């Protein structure tokens, strides 16, 4: 069982998200300090295009996927499902703009 985090694009097991949170998105989703609700809405088990990144800084792939500022690991090219409007508004309150990785927005 593995899920792909909608916001940052990392892929980790769902129990890892429940116990430890997303290591990158914890600063704005508080996933480590949240219930299965936020895990289910901000991470999706249906994805495609597994990506492993070793060096975020110099990888053009990381820049193209906007993951060069995140922890190395498993990443997904496309994630089914989008973030809800309230979470988008909360991110806009923090000043961070959310660009969907579902592919439908370009």
């Amino acid at each position: 069982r593995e899920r792909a985090c909608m916001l940052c694009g990392i892929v980790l097991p769902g129990r890892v998200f429940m116990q430890n949170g997303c290591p990158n998105c914890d600063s704005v989703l508080n996933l480590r300090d949240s219930d299965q609700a936020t895990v289910n809405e901000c991470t999706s088990s249906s994805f495609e295009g597994l990506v492993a990144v070793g060096d975020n800084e110099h990888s053009w792939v990381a820049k193209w996927l906007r993951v060069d500022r995140f922890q190395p690991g498993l990443y997904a090219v496309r994630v089914d499902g989008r973030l809800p409007s309230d979470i988008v508004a909360a991110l806009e309150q923090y000043g961070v703009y959310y660009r969907p990785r579902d592919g439908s927005v370009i």
Binding site: W60, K63, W64, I106
Partner: peptide, 13 residues
């Protein structure tokens, strides 16, 4: 942006 992230010659192969 998204358009600026296009690949150049000096990018890794």
């Amino acid at each position: 942006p998204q358009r600026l992230l296009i690949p150049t010659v000096d990018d890794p192969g």
